[model samples]
Target chain A: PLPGSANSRLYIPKTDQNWVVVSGVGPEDIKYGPGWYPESWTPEGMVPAARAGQPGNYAVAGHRVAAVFWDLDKLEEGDELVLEDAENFYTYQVVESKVVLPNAIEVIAPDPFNPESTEEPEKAYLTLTTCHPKLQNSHRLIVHAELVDTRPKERGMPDNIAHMAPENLEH
Target chain B: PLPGSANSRLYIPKTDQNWVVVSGVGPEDIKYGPGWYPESWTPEGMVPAARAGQPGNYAVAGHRVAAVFWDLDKLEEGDELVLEDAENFYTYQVVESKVVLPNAIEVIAPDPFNPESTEEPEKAYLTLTTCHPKLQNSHRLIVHAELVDTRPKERGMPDNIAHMAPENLEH
Candidate 1:
């Protein structure tokens, strides 16, 4: 098991289908596992539980053709992306998508396009990033989502994740 | 008092002339101070002490115009970049510099340009990253350095830091 697995509490339903789960606070901690997840560097960079229900950006990144995020582009408006832990489940809906230069760091900002904005974010957000054009690294494809619903895990996992048993998840 | 302050350790003679020191493992944590330093993220990123005496990359990032790395571009080959904590001092020399897309994540790899090279790095490395073009975020400016010497802090701060009393440094 990777270090800090016992304290980790994150799992994405879409990627979890492949038995992949994400945890830890930094890139080194999460990279040992297979899946798209956040790189803990900047405040804009996402973390699992802290940003879930907060009014801030919850950003994540993954490889395009590496058995993870391969279908990221297929996520259409209104599609749901669910993130769950042992105690709570948070649901987000796709709101926008765009292709930008790799240097477009603002996309992950609490206020995308306005890095200097000191105002607190007005909404909870989710951003998924992956290399664009498949195997190439010319650009980054970004998907933005908004939190819409949340529930207690004890109420049972979301329907999207009900198909799989919890035992299959890497704690 | 940022998180991880107790663990971080870094100093840049050029930037530290103003008496600024850096600690912690994230952008937010180190930004409060005024010195070029590394950001700890996923394994893909780099840290300071962990990469100092080891054969791996110790990657760091800072704001281009902000107090920390405003003079980063001024560094030339053979110039020294010193990092120290309460107990040890690590010195690295500038070796190369380049501008790359922000997504040029490979620049921080153990063996840059050979991401697939899982073999442990054969030499210790240091990488500095910041947004380029002064205030604009057009691309990322990177500086690569390699370890040249190390000494116990008991010998006292390096001559470059002699200008400031040790009490002025932030723990």
Candidate 2:
């Protein structure tokens, strides 16, 4: 029951098993704002950054702390990440990773390479943003992925995600 | 000059002043092969990895050594880098950075996101690859940039690059 961010659970095998994600694009809020908040929204306009299984760029951000996205820089291409909503599991396979300036919020745009356009692209892209380096917020470390699969919540978790599933997965 | 790596110099204001760049796709070679080599080429296949001011992607790779691309992961969007050939100063702007698997060498390909085809893209891209996470080669930390400006070797150095210019950069 987070305020700004909803209760979507993010599961990453290479980093953390599961993290509490809230809705809204405020990565800096979690820096010193909330105690239980693990990640913030990466979307900006029109919720183009929709929920699990939705088309468009679903953006997410977090702090560089050990409990947060500290090792986000460790994710490589082909690495899988899962997003759990109340009724679905959105599976994302990383396509690329990079670091950008804070103003380069376009990293989460439908077209990251071309920042001028705000139009939603054809693919469903998932992006993860965090502070760059260990102790500096001078830049943001970014990870981009494509939505590869989605499953109805009642039909068990997605393949390869069982080990990382939470204890009470079926709520 | 260095044996495998040529005499071309690479300069990054945020990282290091200048380092040696060789002409082959053997980043692991410098792991123990040569003494003077600092970085390796990121190119393959008919030399699509062309030189500065060329119509192709010019890729570079280095070990994780502190003297090499250790701080490469620090680069952010808009950050500028310089490649000094014998006759020109090829400048690149940091567009994106990410981590990829070793097999994802297609990252140096013409179209990194789409590896199915081998056709070269429109713009000039410079890619830098290095071992990921400081002490492991399980993945490659990648930095991608576009050729923003190119100046004659005799026209001095690109703006903001004076402090990073090597000794007698004109020579």
Candidate 3:
């Protein structure tokens, strides 16, 4: 669903920190939301969010080992990847994490290293994929985020995702 | 995401028939949209629609040759695959196409052949991945669909996707 008019209605908030919250990584290893198709392998790979702030490139994919995305190469750059729903949180950061070649797929394009002259993209990007070093799918482990900030779900859950909210949003 | 209900807002409609249509295949050989984030091949593999008719499993992935999915092994079973956006027109009906081995990742589960005894699924599915015969990624070339019918963007498109609509919906 990558085009625009922003309304690919995707709200995945079944709370438990709702899903993608990385740092020390371990919510039973890892489990992010969204239907990451392509024979479903969860950890990530459910292409969505090319609209949460516009411009395009909110891709995700995973599997580097066990529960998923093994250590993701210790994510660096600026670090801070949060995505929420049920109100709104979406705050990405890590500027550029690397290690590619599972085809590189233009790093999830939208501008990703210029994928044949940027077909179309102006800003907003965030991509996190996996499969590399760890169990070896040969190579590929990117992290790239951007959407700097977006709070307002009553501005309350972001202590690295308040321990995964949803115990009725905890009090 | 795989798990649902948070108001699952997902609406993708930009147009160009939004991609994905098969039946004797050809429209410059094969196109299908979305970032297909896993690599840069694109015959399909842009993860979306896992919520289009509920129940789960709407995967996609491609690349078997040149344009992509080189004929997907000539596709069999009931045969008929179409997915649209700019306003609705989702029709999937293949029933069970074959080939596997890229870990057989549950063949795109949600019940794919009983992916480890159904993680959680009731129905609704459609998967079509590639890489097997043509170029060989070792193995894998599946295809399975189920969501019988859905039409709304004004009750028109569906002459195998009305010539791949998009000239402003072909007037």
Strongest candidate by DockQ: 1
What does candidate 2's lDDT look like per residue over B45-78, in tens digits? 3222455546556676666776777888899999
Candidate 1 lDDT, B25-138, residue by residue in tens: 233333343322232323543432233445666666566666666778887888777765445677888888888876676676765545456555677777777778788677
What local distance difference test score does each model get?
Answer: 0.56, 0.60, 0.49
Q: Candidate 2: count the clashes.
A: 10
RMSD of each: 18.8, 20.6, 19.0
Error of 3 at A64 (Å): 34
- Comparing 2 with 3 on TM-score, the higher-scoring candidate is 2
User: Which of the predicted structures, 1 or 2, would earn the higher DockQ when compared with the native?
Assistant: 1
Give the worst 10-residue stretch by lDDT in candidate 2 chain A. A32-41
> Model 1 misses residue B87 by how many Å?
2.9
Task: Please compute DockQ, using alpha carbons, for every candidate against the native two-chain complex.
Answer: 0.03, 0.01, 0.02
iRMSD (1 decimal) for each model: 16.6, 22.3, 20.3
The residue-level lDDT of candidate 3 at A104 comes to: 56
Cα lDDT for residue B119, candidate 1: 59
- Which candidate achieves the best lDDT against the true structure? 2
Docking class of 3: incorrect
